[PDB]
Ligand binder design. Structure first.
Ligand SMILES: C=CC1=C(C)[C@@H](CC2=N/C(=C\c3[nH]c(/C=C4\NC(=O)C(C)=C4C=C)c(C)c3CCC(=O)O)C(CCC(=O)O)=C2C)NC1=O
Length: 264
């Protein structure tokens, strides 16, 4: 089977991020010791990528490769909390038991107004892709509040379906999301900002505590590295807020040159 089936996914996302965000794009600080992590399982490695703009607090990816039986691309766009933009969540998981694919613009709110603003303009795109990406099935209850009407949840059973149908939805959702980002305007109403902050923290807290990545990273690299990776990078909002680092709509200082390729 394809050993690194998400390498073409990442390469496309990197090219698109770089082109469409241009000079607004700067590196996001990747904590030392979490850029590249390797352990024997064959050699299995985790490669980190991180970026930010004045609208995107954090665009970060974990690309895990431990052979065909263990592949993950976890790519999430986190808006700054002075925007009501949804998250863009792209979880692509390949395990011995098959493929797991979760692609969504995870919403801050489930109101009629929010759905009209962000979900309804995506419905043709959703219906185009869901025809070849059937519903994946049973789904944890607590997570339901964090998914939109255009959630693509599917379990492809052949590599080819990932390389074709999933890849095309992957691209379309990223391009549509960045269209939203381009057009988004800041929120200045303090009441709305307070609610945006609450919903962002709720989502971040759920995934930091409940994401199945915790269990897998723990087996691979142990508990101490895993918790630092999860709370310190993958879902780091609460830490950055509590430490006084996060400032609404402001970039975190980082002088690292932009990187889009594996770092040995
Ligand atoms: C908001 C919640 C949300 C999710 C749960 C994930 C999206 C997601 N990932 C899932 C499942 C899942 N995900 C992984 C593994 C990983 N997922 C990752 O992002 C990384 C980096 C992994 C490994 C290192 C594994 C091993 C499973 C299977 C766990 C199991 O079989 O019990 C599931 C199904 C979980 C289940 O059935 O219980 C979802 C929905 N992303 C999200 O945004």
């Amino acid at each position: 089977a394809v050993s690194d089936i998400y390498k073409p996914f990442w390469e496309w996302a990197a090219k698109t991020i770089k082109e469409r965000l241009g000079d607004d794009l700067v590196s996001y600080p990747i904590p030392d010791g979490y850029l590249r992590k390797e352990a024997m399982v064959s050699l299995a490695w985790t490669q980190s990528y991180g970026y930010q703009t004045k609208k995107m607090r954090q665009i970060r990816a974990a690309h895990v490769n431990g052979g065909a039986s263990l592949q993950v691309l976890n790519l999430v766009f986190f808006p700054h909390m002075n925007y009501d933009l949804p998250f863009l969540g792209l979880d692509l998981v390949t395990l011995p038991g098959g493929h797991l694919i979760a692609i969504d613009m995870q919403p801050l709110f489930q109101t009629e107004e929010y759905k009209k603003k962000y979900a309804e303009p995506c419905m043709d795109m959703y219906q185009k892709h869901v025809k070849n990406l059937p519903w994946g099935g049973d789904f944890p209850e607590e997570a339901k509040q964090y998914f939109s009407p255009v959630f693509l949840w599917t379990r492809p059973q052949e590599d080819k379906q990932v390389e074709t149908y999933v890849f095309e939805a992957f691209k379309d959702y990223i391009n549509k999301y960045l269209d939203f980002v381009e057009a988004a305007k800041p929120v200045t109403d303090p009441d709305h900002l307070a609610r945006i902050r609450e919903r962002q923290l709720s989502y971040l807290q759920y995934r930091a505590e409940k994401d199945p990545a915790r269990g897998m990273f723990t087996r691979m690299y142990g508990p101490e590295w895993t918790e630092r990776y999860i709370h310190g990078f993958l879902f780091d909002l609460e830490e950055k807020m509590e430490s006084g680092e996060y400032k609404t709509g402001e970039l975190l200082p980082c002088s690292d040159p932009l990187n889009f390729q594996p770092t040995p």
